[PDB]
């Protein structure tokens, strides 16, 4: 009947999932470049830049 009896295990799972989610989401930052997608900047500029 009583829920939330297994706390620590759920916390572990949530921590891991959150770490993966933020790692994936980090793939969408310009970091100071012109775009966050690599194929485009490959097909948009010359090798020097």
């Amino acid at each position: 009947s009583t829920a939330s009896a297994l706390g620590k295990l759920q916390d572990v799972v949530n921590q891991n999932a959150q770490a993966l989610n933020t790692l994936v989401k980090q793939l969408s930052s310009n970091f100071g470049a012109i775009s966050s997608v690599l194929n485009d900047i490959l097909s948009r500029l010359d090798p020097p830049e």
């Binding site: 012109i34 485009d40 097909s43 948009r44 500029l45 010359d46």
Partner: protein, 49 residues
């Protein structure tokens, strides 16, 4: 005129930029975010002139 620059919208077209590239009639031919020779591969919409 110098302070009333003419503005033109170009859309729904097909145009070859190689005839513009090889032409020597332009004293200065300089691009910023796109390689001049890549202009016939990727493409966009709503060109401003």
């Amino acid at each position: 005129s110098v302070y009333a620059w003419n503005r033109k919208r170009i859309s729904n077209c097909v145009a070859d930029y190689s005839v513009l590239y090889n032409s020597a009639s332009f004293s200065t031919f300089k691009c910023y975010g796109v390689s001049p020779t890549k202009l016939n591969d990727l493409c966009f919409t709503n060109v401003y002139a």
